[PDB]
Amino acid sequence: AALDTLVQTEARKVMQENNITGLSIAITRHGKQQFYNYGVASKATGQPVSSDTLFELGSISKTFTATLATWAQANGRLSLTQSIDTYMPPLRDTRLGKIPVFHLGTHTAGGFPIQVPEKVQNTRQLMDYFKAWQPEYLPGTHRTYANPSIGLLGVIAARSMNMPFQEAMQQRLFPALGLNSTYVNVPDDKQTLYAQGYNTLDEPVRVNPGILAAEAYGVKSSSRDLIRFVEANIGLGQYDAPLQRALSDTRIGYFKVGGMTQDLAWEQYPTPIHLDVLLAGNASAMLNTQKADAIEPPLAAQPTAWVNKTGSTNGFGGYVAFIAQKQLGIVILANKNYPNEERVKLAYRILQHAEP
Numbered sequence: 001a002a003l004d005t006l007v008q009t010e011a012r013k014v015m016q017e018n019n020i021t022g023l024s025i026a027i028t029r030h031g032k033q034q035f036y037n038y039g040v041a042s043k044a045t046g047q048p049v050s051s052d053t054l055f056e057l058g059s060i061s062k063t064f065t066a067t068l069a070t071w072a073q074a075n076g077r078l079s080l081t082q083s084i085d086t087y088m089p090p091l092r093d094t095r096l097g098k099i100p101v102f103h104l105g106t107h108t109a110g111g112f113p114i115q116v117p118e119k120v121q122n123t124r125q126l127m128d129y130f131k132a133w134q135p136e137y138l139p140g141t142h143r144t145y146a147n148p149s150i151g152l153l154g155v156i157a158a159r160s161m162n163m164p165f166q167e168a169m170q171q172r173l174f175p176a177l178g179l180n181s182t183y184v185n186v187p188d189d190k191q192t193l194y195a196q197g198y199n200t201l202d203e204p205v206r207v208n209p210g211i212l213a214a215e216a217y218g219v220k221s222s223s224r225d226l227i228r229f230v231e232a233n234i235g236l237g238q239y240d241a242p243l244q245r246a247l248s249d250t251r252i253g254y255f256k257v258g259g260m261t262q263d264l265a266w267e268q269y270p271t272p273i274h275l276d277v278l279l280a281g282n283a284s285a286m287l288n289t290q291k292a293d294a295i296e297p298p299l300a301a302q303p304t305a306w307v308n309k310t311g312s313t314n315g316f317g318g319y320v321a322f323i324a325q326k327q328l329g330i331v332i333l334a335n336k337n338y339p340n341e342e343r344v345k346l347a348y349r350i351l352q353h354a355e356p
Contacts, residue, residue, distance in 0.1 A: 061215075282341065303324040
C-alpha cells in the first residue's frame with residue numbers, strides 16, 4: 001500500500017511534468033510482480049493503459065537482437081570472437097568484414113552514423129554501404145552508438161539460423177522466452193492494444209518501416225511481457241542451458257566507457273550505484289563517439305551491477321533497469337519520448353523504496 005502510494009505519486013508527477021498520456025510500470029522483486037497503470041493508450045479511443053497495452057520499445061529492441069546473437073552462439077551457430085566475414089559472405093575481403101562480430105553489439109567496430117544513411121533504401125544498397133565502409137578508429141578504441149552496426153548483428157544472427165530475422169524473433173526467440181505478446185510485426189487482432197504515440201507537439205504518431213528497423217528499434221511489447229524478459233535476465237525462468245547461457249552472455253562486460261560498462265547492447269554500472277553516474281551514462285551526449293577501454297578478459301555477468309537500457313521512438317519512451325543479485329527489476333513504458341533523465345530518476349526512486 002505504501003509502495004503503491006509512492007509509485008502513484010512519482011508516476012503522476014513525471015506525467016504532469018513531461019505531458020505523458022499513458023504510462024505502464026511493472027516491478028519484480030524476488031519473482032513477485034506488481035503492475036501500475038496510468039492514463040490512456042490513445043486520446044482518440046480513451047482506452048486505458050494496462051499491463052497488456054503494446055508500446056514501441058525503440059532501442060530496448062537491441063537487447064533482444066543481442067539475445068538472438070548469444071543464443072545463436074550458445075547453439076554452436078555463431079562464435080562472436082570470429083570475424084564478420086566468417087558469418088556474412090558478401091563482406092568477404094572488406095574492412096568491416098575483418099572485424100570480430102561482438103564489436104557490432106558493443107558499438108566499437110570503427111565509427112558509424114546513428115542512423116542508416118537515407119540513400120540506403122533496400123538490402124542491396126545496405127550491402128554496398130557496408131562494403132564501402134571505412135573505419136575512423138581501430139576496433140574497440142572508441143564507442144559510437146549506432147543502429148547500422150547493431151542491425152547488422154541481427155542480420156548475422158538470423159543468417160546463422162537459416163531464416164529471416166522476423167521469423168527468428170517471432171517464431172523462435174520470443175516463444176522460447178515465453179513472450180506471448182511481443183512483436184516486430186503486430187498482427188490484426190493485437191492491433192487493438194497498440195498504443196498511440198505522441199510527438200514533440202503532442203500529435204499522434206507510430207514508428208515507420210525503415211532499413212534495419214526490425215533489428216535496431218522495431219519491437220513492440222507489453223509491460224507484462226517485458227518484466228518477464230527482465231526476470232529471465234535476473235536468472236529466473238529455468239530455461240534450458242543454451243537459452244540460460246544466451247541471457248547471461250548478453251550481460252558480459254566488454255568495455256569501460258567513462259563510468260559505464262558496455263555489454264552486448266545492455267549497459268551497466270557497478271556498485272556503489274549513485275544516481276549522478278546513472279544520469280551521466282544515460283545522457284544524450286553519450287551518443288557521441290567516446291573513448292573506450294577494452295576489458296580483457298571480458299567481465300563475467302555481474303550480479304551486483306545495475307543493468308539498463310533506454311528505448312525511444314518519435315512517439316514513445318521506455319526504460320528497463322534491474323539488479324540480478326537483489327532480484328530487483330523495473331520496466332517503465334510511456335507513449336511519449338520524454339527525457340532519459342526523468343526515466344532514470346523515476347526508476348531509481350521506485351527501486352530505492354521497493355527494497356526494504
